[PDB]
Amino acid sequence: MNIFEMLRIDEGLRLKIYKDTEGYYTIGIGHLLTKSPSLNAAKSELDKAIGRNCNGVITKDEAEKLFNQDVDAAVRGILRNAKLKDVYDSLDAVRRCALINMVFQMGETGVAGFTNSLRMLQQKRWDEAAVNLAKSRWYNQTPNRAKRVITTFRTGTWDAYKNL
Protein backbone atom coordinates (compact mmCIF):
# COMPACT_ATOMS: atom_id res chain seq x y z
CA MET A 1 0.00 0.00 0.00
CA ASN A 2 1.18 3.53 -0.66
CA ILE A 3 -0.06 7.13 -0.34
CA PHE A 4 -1.79 7.03 -3.70
CA GLU A 5 -3.73 3.84 -3.05
CA MET A 6 -4.62 5.07 0.40
CA LEU A 7 -6.02 8.36 -0.85
CA ARG A 8 -7.78 6.67 -3.71
CA ILE A 9 -9.64 4.59 -1.14
CA ASP A 10 -10.58 7.55 0.98
CA GLU A 11 -11.63 9.97 -1.71
CA GLY A 12 -13.02 7.82 -4.54
CA LEU A 13 -12.82 8.73 -8.25
CA ARG A 14 -15.59 10.79 -9.95
CA LEU A 15 -15.30 12.03 -13.53
CA LYS A 16 -18.15 14.58 -13.33
CA ILE A 17 -18.28 17.70 -11.03
CA TYR A 18 -19.69 16.68 -7.68
CA LYS A 19 -20.26 18.12 -4.23
CA ASP A 20 -18.00 16.94 -1.45
CA THR A 21 -19.05 16.04 2.07
CA GLU A 22 -18.97 19.76 2.89
CA GLY A 23 -21.07 20.65 -0.13
CA TYR A 24 -18.19 22.00 -2.19
CA TYR A 25 -17.61 21.58 -5.88
CA THR A 26 -15.00 18.81 -6.49
CA ILE A 27 -13.92 16.49 -9.28
CA GLY A 28 -11.60 13.47 -9.70
CA ILE A 29 -9.85 12.16 -6.68
CA GLY A 30 -10.88 14.72 -4.07
CA HIS A 31 -9.68 17.76 -6.09
CA LEU A 32 -11.53 20.77 -4.57
CA LEU A 33 -12.50 23.20 -7.26
CA THR A 34 -14.08 26.13 -5.38
CA LYS A 35 -15.85 26.85 -2.11
CA SER A 36 -18.19 29.03 -4.15
CA PRO A 37 -21.82 28.14 -4.60
CA SER A 38 -21.82 28.71 -8.29
CA LEU A 39 -21.61 25.63 -10.51
CA ASN A 40 -20.52 28.19 -13.00
CA ALA A 41 -17.62 29.33 -10.95
CA ALA A 42 -16.80 25.58 -10.66
CA LYS A 43 -16.89 24.89 -14.31
CA SER A 44 -14.56 27.81 -14.87
CA GLU A 45 -12.04 26.69 -12.28
CA LEU A 46 -12.13 23.26 -13.88
CA ASP A 47 -11.35 24.49 -17.35
CA LYS A 48 -8.55 26.60 -15.92
CA ALA A 49 -7.19 23.55 -14.10
CA ILE A 50 -7.22 21.18 -17.12
CA GLY A 51 -6.43 23.63 -19.86
CA ARG A 52 -9.48 22.77 -21.97
CA ASN A 53 -13.22 23.28 -22.19
CA CYS A 54 -14.44 20.41 -20.16
CA ASN A 55 -18.03 21.18 -19.75
CA GLY A 56 -17.92 19.65 -16.20
CA VAL A 57 -16.42 16.41 -17.25
CA ILE A 58 -12.88 14.93 -17.33
CA THR A 59 -11.15 11.70 -18.31
CA LYS A 60 -9.38 9.21 -16.04
CA ASP A 61 -6.04 10.47 -17.23
CA GLU A 62 -6.93 14.06 -16.30
CA ALA A 63 -8.12 12.93 -12.87
CA GLU A 64 -4.90 11.17 -12.20
CA LYS A 65 -2.88 14.13 -13.35
CA LEU A 66 -4.61 16.44 -10.85
CA PHE A 67 -4.12 13.72 -8.26
CA ASN A 68 -0.36 13.59 -8.86
CA GLN A 69 -0.17 17.39 -8.55
CA ASP A 70 -2.20 17.43 -5.34
CA VAL A 71 -0.14 14.74 -3.56
CA ASP A 72 3.06 16.55 -4.60
CA ALA A 73 1.72 19.86 -3.30
CA ALA A 74 0.60 18.18 -0.03
CA VAL A 75 4.11 16.79 0.60
CA ARG A 76 5.85 20.11 -0.39
CA GLY A 77 3.48 21.94 1.86
CA ILE A 78 4.40 19.79 4.87
CA LEU A 79 8.12 20.27 4.12
CA ARG A 80 7.69 24.01 4.00
CA ASN A 81 5.82 24.31 7.18
CA ALA A 82 8.04 24.39 10.29
CA LYS A 83 5.65 22.65 12.70
CA LEU A 84 4.62 20.08 10.13
CA LYS A 85 8.13 19.26 8.92
CA ASP A 86 9.39 18.53 12.40
CA VAL A 87 6.62 16.00 12.93
CA TYR A 88 7.02 14.48 9.49
CA ASP A 89 10.76 13.99 9.92
CA SER A 90 10.18 12.26 13.20
CA LEU A 91 7.79 9.71 11.83
CA ASP A 92 8.16 6.21 10.26
CA ALA A 93 7.08 5.60 6.62
CA VAL A 94 3.51 4.44 7.29
CA ARG A 95 2.75 7.23 9.77
CA ARG A 96 4.10 9.73 7.28
CA CYS A 97 1.31 8.59 4.93
CA ALA A 98 -1.28 9.35 7.62
CA LEU A 99 -0.07 12.96 7.96
CA ILE A 100 -0.05 13.42 4.24
CA ASN A 101 -3.65 12.17 4.11
CA MET A 102 -4.74 14.78 6.71
CA VAL A 103 -3.01 17.57 4.82
CA PHE A 104 -4.57 16.54 1.54
CA GLN A 105 -8.06 16.62 3.12
CA MET A 106 -7.82 19.62 5.28
CA GLY A 107 -4.95 21.77 4.16
CA GLU A 108 -1.69 22.67 5.86
CA THR A 109 -3.25 25.33 7.91
CA GLY A 110 -5.96 23.14 9.21
CA VAL A 111 -3.60 20.33 10.26
CA ALA A 112 -1.15 22.79 11.76
CA GLY A 113 -3.99 23.80 14.09
CA PHE A 114 -3.90 20.33 15.75
CA THR A 115 -1.17 21.57 18.10
CA ASN A 116 -1.63 19.05 20.92
CA SER A 117 -1.98 15.99 18.68
CA LEU A 118 1.12 17.02 16.70
CA ARG A 119 3.17 17.22 19.95
CA MET A 120 1.95 13.80 20.98
CA LEU A 121 2.79 12.25 17.62
CA GLN A 122 6.27 13.81 17.81
CA GLN A 123 6.68 12.27 21.19
CA LYS A 124 5.54 8.94 19.86
CA ARG A 125 2.64 8.67 22.32
CA TRP A 126 0.43 6.70 19.93
CA ASP A 127 -2.53 5.96 22.07
CA GLU A 128 -2.73 9.38 23.51
CA ALA A 129 -2.55 11.05 20.21
CA ALA A 130 -5.33 8.81 18.78
CA VAL A 131 -7.64 9.81 21.56
CA ASN A 132 -6.82 13.53 21.11
CA LEU A 133 -7.26 13.50 17.30
CA ALA A 134 -10.81 12.02 17.77
CA LYS A 135 -11.89 15.22 19.67
CA SER A 136 -12.31 17.27 16.55
CA ARG A 137 -14.93 18.44 14.09
CA TRP A 138 -12.93 16.37 11.53
CA TYR A 139 -13.69 13.12 13.35
CA ASN A 140 -17.32 14.01 13.98
CA GLN A 141 -17.93 14.98 10.38
CA THR A 142 -16.19 12.10 8.57
CA PRO A 143 -15.84 9.44 11.22
CA ASN A 144 -15.06 6.37 9.05
CA ARG A 145 -12.28 8.08 7.16
CA ALA A 146 -10.94 9.75 10.36
CA LYS A 147 -10.92 6.35 12.13
CA ARG A 148 -8.92 4.83 9.30
CA VAL A 149 -6.28 7.63 9.57
CA ILE A 150 -6.29 7.50 13.33
CA THR A 151 -5.70 3.71 13.34
CA THR A 152 -2.85 4.24 10.97
CA PHE A 153 -1.19 6.68 13.40
CA ARG A 154 -2.01 4.47 16.29
CA THR A 155 -0.56 1.22 14.90
CA GLY A 156 1.92 2.21 12.27
CA THR A 157 0.45 -0.49 9.96
CA TRP A 158 -1.96 -0.55 7.03
CA ASP A 159 -4.51 -2.70 8.76
CA ALA A 160 -7.35 -0.14 8.44
CA TYR A 161 -7.09 -0.21 4.72
CA LYS A 162 -6.46 -3.95 4.10
CA ASN A 163 -10.01 -4.55 4.48
CA LEU A 164 -11.06 -2.00 1.85
DSSP string computed for 41-110: HHHHHHHHHHTS--TTB--HHHHHHHHHHHHHHHHHHHHHSHHHHHHHHHS-HHHHHHHHHHHHHHHHHH
Count the alpha carbons within 13 Å of 121 in the hemisphere toward its beta carbon: 33
Active site residue 11: yes
Amino acid (one-letter) located at 58: I
The separation between CA 140 and the C-alpha centre of its own chain, rounded to angstroms, equals: 16
Binding site annotation covers 4?
Answer: no
Binding site annotation covers 104?
Answer: yes
Binding site annotation covers 36?
Answer: no
Residue among 5, 10, 11, 22 flagged as catalytic: 11
Q: How many CB atoms lie within 10 A of CB 57?
A: 12
Nearest-angstrom CA–CA distance, 128 and 154: 9
Binding site annotation covers 140?
Answer: no
Residue among 20, 47, 64, 128 flagged as catalytic: 20
- φ and ψ of 136, to 5 deg: -150, 155
* Residues making up the binding site: 32, 104, 117, 132
* Residues making up the binding site for substrate: 32, 104, 117, 132
List active site positions. 11, 20
